[PDB]
């Protein structure tokens, strides 16, 4: 506990009628590497830019000014980390008549106590009320969809009911480090209406959750490589989810009430040169009621894989068809029943490389008890927003002397803040970049909150020695337990930093509070950003930057006694430069992405780890993990050089069996109670050359397990890898058995 208090802060001090704390907290954020840090506003209240919120005045322009102020990353700019915006909406009804363009690095946030309404004018025109990637003349766009990062929308009612024709709430064409949180969509239920909550046509996601859709022809149209979706509820839609294509998604805690079709899945071809449909859906903990068909495939499967489905713990009440084909036969009869574990696709066991094509029950999926809540379902916990807390319940790091200017050493100021306030006040990291040169230990009990781009950036000699790696951030002391909630933070390095363990996570849940220790909208954005020392100017793809281009040793280290609920966390070793212009590829060196030795519970909900040398995920002597979906990419320079270079072998942090020319996506040693429920593990290059994509042999192996680990994989999708699955570094499952469009999919693997 911090020295300023004697009992922990366990609830907020706000009066019931006070506005949400974010409105009146002091606004002190800085964009450290902006052209004008002293004049560029991070926080923008829409009402300060002329918005009335009276439901009659057209507020479109005023909101757009709140978004646009300061000279931001719009047309002609690829991406940025230096032009953030938190666009804030106090309660009210905001009438809008054309799309709100949510520029790169923008969050739209409403009052969480009394959700503001975005009200579509009867004459609304444009792609959607909120547009994260506008289309221009000739079908060019503001941003490349696969690079469309750093976007959030939180705490709104989006009301389309005044629009007589077609209308869409959100054009959510996005990739990683994005979120939708706590939105209610209100749409028409009139026969023939053309309302649609979300339209997403492509991208590389991503996490979204805690949404409610009321009415409409379509709740959400989804098309994207991969995404994790948690706690979506659809009421009275014609089609809840129109899934047009993917490589693979995970849907957790979905509720569908009174719809015609729950999941309408488009079946595509199996060739990587053919039509792409929905490769794979993994659905866990669903409740479906009074709905004609729960899952509908657009075409039938004929004794071989062509679109994968895994269903786990599905409660149906008056749902005649559990799994059906559009204008075709029932595949799984519904009614009123609970589906334990069911699959469509190729099922595998042990070292048997030959598929069992299945459309039927599979062995009950094991769900370790510690990963389940009192209702027996995978834990579901939203981004903590402290809705009952007053501004006085927070302490500002700026007010306590942390500059956040990307230059001043803020190590002592930050240490002092934790020493004084941990557990006494919510720690508010005003937007900025905070240079630290020693370990920042976040005590057990602490709650920390950022502001769009709040970065702790470790650098200097404490972090440069790969023979003696050291933690930049320490989440709890070793052996600690308690609440640790981290929201909207970035943790990273200023290079070179060959010894940095960016986050060492030690704390465990206290008794009786699951997921008390966790992170949301919190990412490790490693290199590729302004004044990181890890940009194209320092680290060209030639590799000429050499020893200057060590970015970290390890992204995330979950230690033996820890637990963690990590939602949407991207542990990204930069493959390209976000700030120099032109999205130029770069070569940076990270030894490994995520290593867990935790005995659990660990929930990795929509996490990703990309471009690390030895592995993206390494589970070493771990237990009780729920992981879904997990997504990975191999670094683009491999196999030039082969792992572990330019690091050296380290028996403490490396797996026993190093990657064969390329990093493992996931490698597992001596672990038990591991459930991987949706995975997207990809390889796109051989030393920056894309030729391997056609023969689909960019790397030879990608997932490794030892002989004894108690682990199961469901809906494991890989890209351009010969052996999708290995035991003891010998390929067992060949991609030739599982072609599923652009990607290849293993529907289930178990040890026995």
Ligand X SMILES: *[C@@H]1O[C@H](CO)[C@@H](O[C@@H]2O[C@H](CO)[C@@H](O[C@@H]3O[C@H](CO)[C@@H](O)[C@H](O)[C@@H]3O)[C@H](O)[C@H]2NC(C)=O)[C@H](O)[C@H]1NC(C)=O
CA distance 693 to 698: 6
| 538 near ligand X, judged by CB under 6 A | no
Residues that bind Zn ion (CB under 5 A): 487, 575-576
Q: Are 105 and 60 in contact (CB under 8 A)?
A: no
Candidates 211-219, 442-450, 526-534, 591-599; binding stretch for Na ion (CB under 5 A): 591-599
CA distance 25 to 12: 14
CA distance 108 to 296: 34
Q: State the CB neighbour count (10 A cutoff) for residue 74.
A: 16
Q: State the CB neighbour count (10 A cutoff) for residue 364.
A: 10
| 212 near ligand X, judged by CB under 6 A | yes
CA distance 663 to 40: 41
Candidates 241-249, 342-350, 358-366, 597-605; binding stretch for Na ion (CB under 5 A): 597-605
| 514 near ligand X, judged by CB under 6 A | no
Nearest to 328 by CA among 295, 281, 280: 295
304 is in an annotated binding site: no
Candidates 24-32, 236-244, 436-444, 590-598; binding stretch for Na ion (CB under 5 A): 590-598
Pull the structure tokens for residue 748. Answer: 């289930």
| 317 near ligand X, judged by CB under 6 A | no
Which residue has the CB atom at the shortest distance from Zn ion? 576
488 is in an annotated binding site: yes
600 is in an annotated binding site: yes
Which residue has the CB atom at the shortest distance from ligand X? 210
The label of the residue with tokens 């020493």 reads 419
> Which residue in the set 111, 131, 210, 744 belongs to the binding site for ligand X (CB under 6 A)?
210
Candidates 380-388, 430-438, 644-652, 717-725; binding stretch for ligand X (CB under 6 A): 380-388
CA distance 405 to 660: 42
Nearest to 714 by CA among 255, 366, 380: 366
- CA 238, 241, 247 angle in degrees (round to 5)? 155
The distance of closest approach from Cβ of residue 558 to Zn ion in the complex, given in angstroms and rounded to an integer, is 11
Q: Map the footprint of ligand X across residues 153-182, applying CB under 6 A.
A: 182
508 is in an annotated binding site: yes
The distance of closest approach from Cβ of residue 751 to ligand X in the complex, given in angstroms and rounded to an integer, is 31
The distance of closest approach from Cβ of residue 406 to Na ion in the complex, given in angstroms and rounded to an integer, is 25
The label of the residue with tokens 């320490």 reads 474
Preceding amide of 644 cis, omega within 30: yes
CA distance 474 to 596: 15
> Which residue in the set 64, 308, 346, 380 belongs to the binding site for ligand X (CB under 6 A)?
380
> Which residue in the set 59, 78, 662, 744 belongs to the binding site for Na ion (CB under 5 A)?
78
575 is in an annotated binding site: yes
Q: Residue 387 touches which of Na ion, ligand X, Zn ion, none (CB < 5 to 8 A by kind)?
A: ligand X
Q: Map the footprint of ligand X across residues 385-444, applying CB under 6 A.
A: 387
Q: Are 482 and 562 in contact (CB under 8 A)?
A: no
| 117 near ligand X, judged by CB under 6 A | no
| 231 near ligand X, judged by CB under 6 A | yes
The distance of closest approach from Cβ of residue 152 to Zn ion in the complex, given in angstroms and rounded to an integer, is 9
What is the sign of the dihedral through the CA atoms of 648, 652, 658 and 659? negative
- The residue (of 40 and 185) whose beta carbon lies closer to ligand X is 185
DSSP letters spanning 431-476: SEEEEESS-EEE-TT-EEE--SSEEEEE-SGGG--TTS-EEEEEES
672 is in an annotated binding site: no
CA distance 629 to 74: 31
- Supply φ then ψ for residue 168, to 5 degrees: -130, 140
Candidates 169-177, 379-387, 398-406, 512-520; binding stretch for ligand X (CB under 6 A): 379-387
- The residue (of 458 and 606) whose beta carbon lies closer to ligand X is 606
Q: Residue 576 touches which of Zn ion, ligand X, Na ion, none (CB < 5 to 8 A by kind)?
A: Zn ion
> Which residue in the set 44, 47, 195, 253 belongs to the binding site for ligand X (CB under 6 A)?
253
Cα→Cα distances 182→37, 110, 164, 167, Å: 31, 10, 26, 20
Nearest to 429 by CA among 404, 405, 406: 404
| DSSP summary character for residue 49 | G
| DSSP summary character for residue 418 | H
| 382 near ligand X, judged by CB under 6 A | yes
- The residue (of 285 and 504) whose beta carbon lies closer to ligand X is 285
Footprint of Na ion (CB under 5 A): 78, 597
User: Which residues line the annotated binding site?
Assistant: 383, 488, 508, 575-576, 600
Footprint of ligand X (CB under 6 A): 182, 184, 210, 212, 231, 253, 380, 382, 387
User: Which residues line the annotated binding site for Zn(2+)?
Assistant: 383, 488, 508, 575-576, 600
């Amino acid at each position: 506990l911090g020295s300023t208090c004697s009992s922990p802060l366990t609830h907020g001090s706000a009066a019931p009628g006070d506005p949400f704390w974010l409105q009146n907290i002091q606004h002190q954020g800085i964009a450290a590497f902006n052209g004008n840090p002293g004049g560029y506003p991070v926080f923008r209240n829409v009402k300060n830019y002329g918005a009335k919120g009276d439901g009659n005045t057209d507020d479109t322009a005023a909101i757009q000014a709140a978004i646009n102020a300061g000279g931001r990353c719009g047309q002609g700019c690829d991406s940025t980390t230096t032009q953030p915006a938190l666009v804030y909406f106090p309660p009210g009804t905001y009438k809008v008549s054309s799309p709100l363009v949510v520029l790169y690095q923008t969050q739209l946030i409403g009052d969480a106590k009394n959700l503001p309404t975005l009200l579509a004018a009867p004459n609304f025109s444009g792609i959607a009320l909120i547009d994260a990637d506008p289309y221009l003349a000739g079908g060019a766009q503001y941003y490349v969809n696969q690079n469309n990062f750093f976007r959030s929308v939180r705490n709104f009612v989006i009301d389309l009911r005044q629009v007589s024709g077609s209308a869409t709430g959100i054009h959510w064409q996005v990739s990683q480090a994005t979120s939708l949180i706590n939105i209610v969509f209100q749409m028409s239920t009139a026969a023939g209406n053309q309302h649609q909550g979300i339209f997403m046509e492509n991208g590389s996601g991503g996490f979204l959750g805690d949404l409610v859709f009321n009415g409409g022809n379509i709740g959400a149209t989804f098309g994207n490589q991969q995404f994790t979706v948690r706690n979506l509820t659809f009421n009275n839609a014609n089609t809840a989810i129109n899934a047009i294509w993917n490589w693979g998604w995970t849907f957790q805690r979905i509720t569908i009430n009174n719809c015609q079709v729950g999941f309408d899945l488009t079946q595509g071809g199996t060739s990587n040169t053919g039509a792409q449909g929905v490769g794979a859906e993994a659905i866990i903990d669903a409740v479906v009621t009074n709905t004609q068909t729960f899952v509908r495939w657009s075409g039938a499967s004929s004794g071989h894989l062509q679109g994968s489905l895994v269903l786990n713990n599905i409660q149906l009440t008056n749902v005649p068809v559990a799994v059906g084909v559009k204008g075709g036969p029932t595949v799984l009869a519904g009614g009123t029943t609970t589906i334990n574990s069911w699959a469509q696709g190729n099922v595998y066991h042990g070292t048997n490389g030959n598929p069992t094509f299945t459309q039927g029950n599979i062995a009950n999926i094991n769900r370790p008890g510690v990963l389940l809540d009192s209702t027996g379902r995978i834990v579901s916990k939203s981004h903590p927003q402290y809705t009952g807390y007053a501004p006085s319940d927070f302490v500002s790091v700026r007010s306590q002397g942390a500059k956040g200017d990307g230059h001043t050493d803020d190590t002592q100021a930050i240490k002092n803040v934790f020493a004084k306030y941990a557990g006494c006040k919510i720690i508010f990291f005003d937007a900025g970049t905070y240079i630290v040169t020693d370990t920042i230990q976040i005590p057990a009990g602490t709650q920390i909150v950022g502001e769009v781009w709040s970065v702790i950036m470790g650098t200097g000699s404490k972090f440069t020695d790969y023979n003696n790696p050291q933690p930049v951030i320490q989440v709890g002391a070793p052996g600690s337990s308690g609440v640790v909630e981290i929201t909207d933070m970035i943790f990273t390095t200023r290079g070179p930093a060959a010894g940095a363990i960016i986050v060492e996570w030690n704390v465990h849940d206290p008794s009786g509070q699951q997921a008390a220790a966790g992170a949301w909208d919190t990412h490790l954005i490693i290199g590729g950003t302004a004044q990181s020392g890890l940009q194209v100017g320092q680290c060209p793809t030639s590799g000429a930057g050499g020893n200057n281009c060590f970015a970290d040793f390890l992204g995330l280290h979950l230690t033996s006694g820890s637990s963690a609920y990590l939602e949407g966390m991207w542990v990204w070793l930069a493959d390209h430069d976000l700030d120099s212009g032109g999205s130029q590829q770069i070569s940076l060196w990270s030894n490994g992405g995520i290593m867990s030795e935790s005995q659990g519970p660990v929930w990795l909900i929509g996490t990703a780890s990309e471009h690390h040398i030895n592995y993206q995920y390494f589970l070493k002597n771990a237990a009780n993990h729920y992981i879904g979906l997990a997504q990975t990419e191999t670094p683009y320079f491999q196999p030039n050089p082969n792992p572990p270079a330019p690091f050296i072998t380290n028996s403490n942090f490396d797996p026993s069996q190093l990657g064969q020319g390329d990093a493992w996506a996931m490698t597992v040693q001596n672990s038990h109670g591991i459930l991987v429920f949706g995975a997207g593990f990809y390889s796109f290059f051989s030393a920056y050359n894309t030729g391997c994509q056609s023969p689909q042999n960019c790397q030879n192996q990608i997932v490794n397990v030892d002989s004894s680990s108690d682990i199961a994989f469901y809906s494991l999708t890989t890209v351009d890898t010969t052996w999708q699955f290995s035991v003891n570094a010998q390929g067992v499952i060949n991609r030739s058995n599982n072609p599923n469009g652009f990607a290849d999919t293993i529907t289930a693997w178990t040890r026995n």
